[PDB]
Amino acid sequence: GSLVCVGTGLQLAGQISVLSRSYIEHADIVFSLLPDGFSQRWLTKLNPNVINLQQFYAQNGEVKNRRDTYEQMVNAILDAVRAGKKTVCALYGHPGVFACVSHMAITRAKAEGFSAKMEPGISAEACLWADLGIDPGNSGHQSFEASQFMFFNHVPDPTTHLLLWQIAIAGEHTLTQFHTSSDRLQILVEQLNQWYPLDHEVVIYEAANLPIQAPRIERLPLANLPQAHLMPISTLLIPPAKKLEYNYAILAKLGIGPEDL
Amino acid sequence: GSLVCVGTGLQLAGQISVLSRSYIEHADIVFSLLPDGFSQRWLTKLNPNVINLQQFYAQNGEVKNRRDTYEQMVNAILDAVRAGKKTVCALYGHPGVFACVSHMAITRAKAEGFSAKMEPGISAEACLWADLGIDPGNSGHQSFEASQFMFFNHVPDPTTHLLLWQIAIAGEHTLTQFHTSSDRLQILVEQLNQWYPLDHEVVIYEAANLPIQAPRIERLPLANLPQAHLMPISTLLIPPAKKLEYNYAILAKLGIGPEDLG
Amino acid sequence: GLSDFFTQLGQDAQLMEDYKQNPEAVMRAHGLTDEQINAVMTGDMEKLKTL
Amino acid sequence: LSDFFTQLGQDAQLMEDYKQNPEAVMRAHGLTDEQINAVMTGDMEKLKTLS
Ligand SMILES: C[S@@+](CC[C@H](N)C(=O)[O-])C[C@H]1O[C@@H](n2cnc3c(N)ncnc32)[C@H](O)[C@@H]1O
């Protein structure tokens, strides 16, 4: 048995890598977590031996810690590897970006002496730079899970593009609910107001998952975030609020002057 | 005519998206900014009508402003679009990451009333998370260009995975052109030592470009960075110096405590 | 028919460029109903999953 | 050699076959002794010559 974790990107059918599609095609069995039924149909035509990981999320009125969903997904994948199957995990986007299941399954498979690896995919962030026409390399960029930002002591650099992922469950502490409330979002706005003005323009971004679909690129003042309609697929982009300042201490050591930049 | 800018990702042939390969295949003309010779040969076999943008860079040590080179590249692309060609630009990695020519050409094409768009591709950053088995979301992620990090005030969050891009040319400048790599990297170590111990394990990462080649993943103490052999593709990963600590102020506002976190 | 069309449109750059020029003509030529074409043109993703 | 590297990069079955015995797979795909030796020794600058 062996494990390869691949990403399908965000857009239906066309955003998977050539090699990643080849892994799915040649797999004994595929474990899938895909955005919608169109993607599921596409995958099933590529390889009919699919197990949908969606089934391990809390269903008909069950209270289930998301950690236990992830553990059951990892166990399901590893059961196929242990049985001797050439196993592929097909996750939407990049399988290792704001996703623990692939990282966990690869670690566990390696510990049990199985061949395992991750193939990079096109993430929601990769789609965001393209759709917004931003070069994040030169500009710099930062990413935090919205809840981790609230529950733990994080400091953003307000001169640099800030992404808050999973904004729709921001401050939901139980990990048993798949939304949050405007009171939790109001507390996040107050937290962000340390560095970002209340009238600071932020962007609710949703990459399109279908080729007939335009992305959501919704500009609004930070203050209005708590009233905004958010989806599980929503990412919040907070552009810089603060002008760059010269690092005089380091420029001096380099022997270069501000005038020169 | 029309313009689509696509990325090939980092790895030869296999890392391009299915749609992006289709755009190259069906293009009237392709403008390439690819490295290698294997990358260039792969492209030319997919679509023989390729113009190599590399021709517009300074050759023979002539003084040539990067601004002028990029303008000449964008003008060459737009001339094809203007003439009515279904024009595709094939860039390395993600066509919008550490690249201005694609953004500039798309802006100018739209302004002239042409259809133009960018297709996202797999970046060196995408490859790093997969190769290192690190999730940017685990404790958060900050990426800076190493020179921008030195020239400007950017105080990192040392609970995050911190990436310094283009580490080989950190602090490099016309003024500091006679300074040596080792000298400039020693200044960066002293800067980072504000937040990271000198024995802090860091990672020099180079994504592989050929399927017969493994990525560079070199783990060394921060103090040893100035002695390291670096490539233009080299990136510095600085793992967290501090564990995550509870935000009691915000937990208080949420009316919960640590024992309440699922 | 709708799923087959979206899958081809997603990965076929010739079809995607044709679709950008004349979405309704391309959708008709791929066997979509007036109901499906209306759901697409009004950007109603929920109704598309239905049809 | 270029044709082989392209196939190896794109084809998950060839990539897995190659990992299990690189020299046998490279022989089967008609690579030269010097090409195979350059691959196995990671001599990238020699691979330039022979392409
Ligand atoms: C569990 S993570 C999965 C991310 C995925 N592995 C990727 O590469 O983008 C879910 C989060 O990813 C982001 N996300 C997922 N789909 C998105 C989309 N279509 N547009 C924007 N952000 C999206 C959101 O922040 C969402 O809460």
Author numbering:
A (entry chain A): 2 to 262
B (entry chain C): 2 to 263
C (entry chain B): 3 to 53
D (entry chain D): 4 to 54
What text comes from the article?
Here we report the discovery of type IV borosin natural product pathways (termed ‘split borosins’), featuring an iteratively acting α-N-methyltransferase and separate precursor peptide substrate from the metal-respiring bacterium Shewanella oneidensis. The α-N-methyltransferase SonM from Shewanella oneidensis MR-1 iteratively methylates its substrate SonA at two residues, SonA-L63 and SonA-I65, in an N-to-C terminal fashion on the core peptide. Complexes of SonM and SonA form dimers of heterodimers. A five helical bundle at the N-terminus of SonA, now referred to as the borosin binding domain (BBD; 1–53), serves as the SonA leader peptide and is homologous to a portion of the fused clasp region of OphMA.
To further test the role of the core peptide on the binding of SonA to SonM, the Ki for a BBD-only construct (SonA-BBD; 1–55) was estimated to be 3.9 μM. Indeed, one of the heterodimers is bound to the cofactor SAM, and the overall conformation is similar to the heterodimer SonM—SonA-2Me—SAH structure. The cognate SonM—SonA-BBD heterodimer is without cofactor, and shows large conformational changes as compared to the apo SonM—SonA-2Me structure. The active site binding cleft in the SonM—SonA-BBD heterodimer appears largely open, and there are diverse conformational changes compared to the other, cofactor-bound heterodimer. Most prominently, the residue SonM-Y93 that interacts with the cofactor adopts a completely different rotamer (the hydroxyl group of the side chain differs by 7.3 Å between the apo heterodimer SonM—SonA-BBD and the apo SonM—SonA-2Me structure). The top clamp that is typically observed in closed conformation in the other SonM—SonA-2Me structures, but also in OphMA and dbOphMA structures, relocates by nearly 14 Å. Indeed, a careful analysis and comparison of both conformations reveals an interaction network between the cofactor SAM, the side clamp, and the top clamp. Specifically, the binding of SAM, and in particular the ribose moiety, appears to sterically hinder and induce a conformational change for residues SonM-W166 and SonM-F99. Relocation of SonM-F99 (Domain A; ~2.8 Å) and SonM-W166 (Domain B; ~2 Å) brings both residues closer (4.8 Å in the apo structure vs. 3.4 Å) to a near-canonical π–π sandwich-stacking configuration.
